[PDB]
């Protein structure tokens, strides 16, 4: 079926990235030793 683009792959990649960036931002804003 050359009419179906695997959207679950991109969706999971984007969600994983969003979670990673959110955890990093949370660590930066709530930094323990990043002064």
């Amino acid at each position: 079926d050359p009419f179906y683009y695997d959207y679950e792959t991109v969706r999971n990649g984007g969600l994983i990235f969003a979670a990673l960036a959110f955890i990093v931002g949370l660590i930066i804003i709530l930094s323990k030793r990043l002064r």
Binding site: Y5, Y7, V10, R11, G13, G14, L15, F17, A18, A19, A21, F22, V24, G25, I28, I29, S31, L34, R35
Partner: protein, 995 residues
């Protein structure tokens, strides 16, 4: 306001008639020791804190609701209401309808809730931090409890407490005078007249206001000292009933916020005009009545920077906190912006530039210079302690002294103990106690009959003592003061024990020694005494102090004593930065011109090369009157000359001089200097610590009062309080004042940049008739949802390296929002961001089947919900929702492109003068915003269900990188622009783009 002389004269009932025994038995207080701490706490918990009832505080559920239903949120609320109403209208019509209008309304409501919550969070942070200053340095009251005198919080004062106030002290509460010695209070705030009225324990008048044994609340002790007993506290005070209901503050206008309000009203007017014009345009374009309000809301949102006021509040409170942490307490929020515009700083020499820690180092007696005060190694002095003249010098230096040592000090040395008196008197005490003996015995033998304190009228001290010897005429007069003035009041000098007439040679030698010690940066004091003849003044003679009868002139000069007072540590660096920032610093002291000149030259006030008229005359051996007045860049104006000068001469000296130093200037003359400085069109900052400085502190643009040695009058009469009295703190505050302007402008340049890329899609959609590239839901998620944190991150940026290398700013011409700022946000960066978003839009549409050229004019059939046969560039047929999904994917891509270009815009906005590589990414909140907005966009694009909720669909990977070149282009362009501005100051680039 008929609240004075009418609502005060009748509400009055006191106990001034009660005697010491009646007062003691009524209030129950130890007149000689004060109440016990236990009783003090008992009364504090019984009557309540010594304060006025505060105004009602709005609860937490009031501000939140008032923000939720605010002004801007009202448009979104009405939009959501219209959407819900349209969904109900569609539910009554055709069965099985869609939930598009319902989802749109729910989205608008969720957006309103999030916006209100974030705004309330920031407003709560601002109000909570602002309140932190009211409890930074509370006002203290010196009370006497359990015999000991201690300083406690003003609100901890209870009725009956034994309170003691002195010159410059604020009256804690209504008191009943018990003991007083020449106390003068100012009832200007009470009766109106500023004439100081004396206060005495004796009952003088039955009226409480006219009596002399009562001190009222809010008044201040101008001169003297007294002890009273609290008769009324808190709201019960006489002045309290008036100050709680008739002394409320008015509507003080803050220009830093007013300018933003004006710019906000103009941008709001233009935004609403474009919104209504587009509303009618869309209505004419055969569009739904609800879609017209949707386009209107989107345009207003993307064109009105609704967080500007919040950004201003955040920047102001943050810098206020910064100044507070750096020994600069701003009493009001307006002074925080006046500091950045400071151009003339009239500081004092003793107390601010120096540490006021004097130490006796050199002396002059027997026509010789003597160093002394050995390093407490019992080495004594460099001369013999048996010198006859030295005895007559130490005698008048210890007897005329008024300072004494406190208790619990006989276990540690004299060079590290505590004293009670003048710094000069403390140095003299530590000197005569380290090389002569004990002053407790010398002052006891020579019993003092009458003493004249230091007065501006006399300009000298005085003390008459009976001598217990046998070959003296039972009377010894001792006095110290200005060495020059003490010299003119004497006819003889003591040389190795023999008194000889003071000839011209001795006076010339004295002048040489004075110039020698004064050029060393030391304050010199003159001393003299006289053995009044016994024939004229017998043993029973009574010297009158009020009616001077004893001889005041023709005394016997004994010697000079000089002490060292080193300047503060960062003072040389502070004046260097001030000279490097175009801020004129003026020294205002009451010391001798030689000492003031030497200290000014040493601390950096008078840098190398600059000479005064006197220096030029001495260098070319010509009379000072022959020298050209304009040939001296610096000058040392004497007090006598300032008194006999006119406004013209004042403007002349203050205009054609770069380094001015006013010596022997009384503290009252500071007002004239401040007026003359303001007359030259300069924002003046003046330092004050005494009570006489108040006119100068109130008249000046920025009154800085000493927080340690400064009295309550100066603190309440000033605009800023120096927590450490260090001059370097003023420069630090000026720098932070410039920092608020810098960060506010950088933040504005960023919040306004997002306007062009967010509003251009509609303009092209209407002029080029291409499918809508950016939707309203996307615009809301951008402005109100992602750039909420980045817009504030620009406030936490640090200062550039050129913050202290630029000229001061004048508020009359330099404003925040200027033409160069708009030319940057709307003309250069905005255009690049819009092109980047459009590029990604064309990429998506071309990759899905619609070539960029073919898209022109297709919007008519694109929005048509029944033409489900749209032919693409390849000839394929698309339905309505099929192509609408692509348009929405384009909206999401445009949003991602917006975030991408926002990264570069935020980075380049961190600095406006230096390169991003010099400033660095030390801003943690900025990086946090950089990560959070990208993560939020990624979530809004990849979260499941968003395709049917927010109409945002997943974005393919090969698209997230479409706007990268535009981001890099913005970055390189801003860096090269800043590079050209750095390499060519005052150039066209600077005069055209430097906002």
């Amino acid at each position: 306001e008929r609240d004075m002389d009418e609502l005060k004269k009748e509400v009055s009932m006191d106990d001034h008639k009660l005697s010491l025994d009646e007062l003691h038995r009524k209030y129950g207080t130890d007149l000689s020791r004060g109440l016990t701490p236990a009783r003090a706490a008992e009364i504090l918990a019984r009557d309540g804190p010594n304060a006025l009832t505060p105004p009602p505080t709005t609860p937490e559920w009031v501000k939140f609701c008032r923000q939720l239903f605010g002004g801007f949120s009202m448009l979104l609320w009405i939009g959501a209401i219209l959407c819900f109403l349209a969904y109900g209208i569609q539910a009554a019509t055709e069965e099985e309808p869609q939930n598009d209008n319902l989802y749109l309304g729910v989205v608008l409501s969720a957006v309103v809730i999030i916006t209100g919550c974030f705004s309330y969070y920031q407003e709560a942070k601002s109000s909570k931090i602002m309140e932190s200053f009211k409890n930074m340095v509370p006002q203290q009251a010196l009370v006497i409890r359990n015999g000991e005198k201690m300083s406690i919080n003003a609100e901890e004062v209870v009725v009956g407490d034994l309170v003691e106030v002195k010159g410059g002290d604020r009256i804690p509460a209504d008191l009943r005078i018990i003991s007083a010695n020449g106390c003068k209070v100012d009832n200007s705030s009470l009766t109106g007249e500023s004439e100081p009225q004396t206060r005495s324990p004796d009952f003088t008048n039955e009226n409480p206001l006219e009596t002399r044994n009562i001190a009222f609340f809010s008044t201040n002790c101008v001169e003297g000292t007294a002890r009273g007993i609290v008769v009324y506290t808190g709201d019960r005070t006489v002045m309290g009933r008036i100050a709680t209901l008739a002394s409320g503050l008015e509507g003080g206008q803050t220009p830093i916020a007013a300018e933003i309000e004006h710019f906000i009203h103009i941008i709001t007017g233009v935004a609403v005009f474009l919104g209504v014009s587009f509303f009618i345009l869309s209505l004419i374009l055969e569009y739904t009545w609800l879609e017209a309000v949707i386009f209107l809301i989107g345009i207003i949102v993307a064109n009105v920077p609704e967080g500007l006021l919040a950004t201003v509040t955040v920047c102001l409170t943050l810098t206020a906190k910064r100044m507070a942490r750096k020994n600069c307490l701003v009493k009001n929020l307006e002074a925080v912006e006046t500091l950045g515009s400071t151009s003339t700083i009239c500081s004092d020499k003793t107390g601010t530039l120096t540490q006021n820690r004097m130490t006796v180092a050199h002396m002059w007696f027997d026509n010789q210079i003597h160093e002394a005060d050995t390093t407490e190694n019992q080495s004594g002095v460099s001369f013999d302690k048996t010198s006859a003249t030295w005895l007559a010098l130490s005698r008048i230096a210890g007897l005329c002294n008024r300072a004494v040592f406190q208790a619990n000090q006989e276990n540690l040395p004299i060079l590290k103990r505590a004293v009670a008196g003048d710094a000069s008197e403390s140095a003299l005490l530590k000197c005569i106690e380290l090389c002569c003996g004990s002053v407790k015995e010398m002052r006891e033998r020579y019993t003092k009959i009458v003493e004249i304190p230091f007065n501006s009228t006399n300009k000298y001290q005085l003390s008459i003592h009976k001598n217990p010897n046998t070959a003296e005429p039972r009377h010894l007069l001792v006095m110290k003061g200005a060495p020059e003035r003490i010299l003119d009041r004497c006819s003889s000098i003591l040389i190795h024990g023999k008194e000889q007439p003071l000839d011209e040679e001795l006076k010339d030698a004295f002048q040489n020694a004075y110039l020698e010690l004064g050029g060393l940066g030391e304050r010199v004091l003159g001393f003299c005494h006289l053995f009044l003849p016994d024939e004229q003044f017998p043993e029973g003679f009574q010297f009158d102090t009020d009616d001077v009868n004893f001889p005041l002139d023709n005394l016997c000069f004994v010697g000079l004593i000089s002490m060292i007072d080193p300047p503060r540590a960062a003072v040389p660096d502070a004046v260097g930065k001030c000279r490097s920032a175009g801020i004129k610093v003026i020294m205002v002291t009451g010391d001798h011109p030689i000492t003031a000149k030497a200290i000014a030259k040493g601390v950096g006030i008078i840098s190398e090369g600059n000479e005064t008229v006197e220096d030029i005359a001495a260098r070319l051996n010509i009379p000072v009157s022959q020298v050209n007045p304009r040939d001296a860049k610096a000058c040392v104006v004497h007090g006598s000359d300032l008194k006999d000068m006119t406004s013209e001469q004042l403007d002349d000296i203050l205009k054609y001089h770069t380094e001015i130093v006013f010596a022997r200037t009384s503290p009252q003359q500071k007002l004239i200097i401040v007026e003359g400085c303001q007359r030259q069109g300069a924002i003046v900052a003046v330092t004050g610590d005494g009570v006489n400085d108040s006119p100068a502190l109130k008249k000046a643009d920025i009154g800085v009062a000493m927080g340690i040695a400064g009295s309550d009058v100066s603190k309440q009469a000033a605009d800023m309080i120096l927590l450490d009295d260090n001059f370097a703190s003023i420069v630090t505050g000026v720098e932070e004042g410039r920092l608020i302007f810098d960060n506010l402008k950088k933040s504005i340049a960023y919040t306004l940049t997002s306007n062009i890329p967010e509003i251009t899609p509609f303009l092209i959609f209407i002029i080029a008739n291409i499918p809508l590239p950016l939707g309203t839901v996307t615009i809301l998620c951008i402005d109100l949802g992602t750039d909420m944190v980045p817009a504030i991150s620009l406030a936490y940026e640090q200062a550039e390296s050129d913050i202290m290398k630029r000229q001061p700013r004048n508020p009359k011409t330099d404003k925040l929002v200027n033409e160069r700022l708009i030319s940057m946000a709307y003309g250069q960066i905005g255009m690049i961001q819009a092109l980047g978003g459009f590029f990604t839009y064309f990429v998506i549409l071309a990759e899905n089947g619609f070539l960029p050229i073919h898209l022109l004019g297709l919007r008519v059939n694109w929005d048509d919900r029944w033409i489900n046969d749209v032919e693409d560039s390849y000839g394929q047929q698309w339905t309505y929702e099929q192509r609408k999904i692509v348009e929405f994917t384009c909206h999401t891509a445009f949003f991602v492109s917006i975030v991408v270009v926002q990264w570069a815009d935020l980075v380049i906005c961190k600095t406006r003068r230096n390169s991003v590589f010099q400033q660095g990414m030390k801003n943690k909140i900025l990086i946090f915003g950089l990560f959070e907005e990208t993560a939020l966009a990624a979530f809004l694009s990849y979260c499941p269900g968003m395709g049917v909720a927010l109409r945002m669909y997943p974005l393919k990977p090969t698209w997230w990188f479409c706007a990268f070149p535009y981001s890099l282009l913005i970055f390189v362009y801003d860096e090269v622009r800043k590079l050209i501005i750095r390499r060519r100051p005052g150039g066209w680039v600077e005069k055209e783009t430097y906002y």
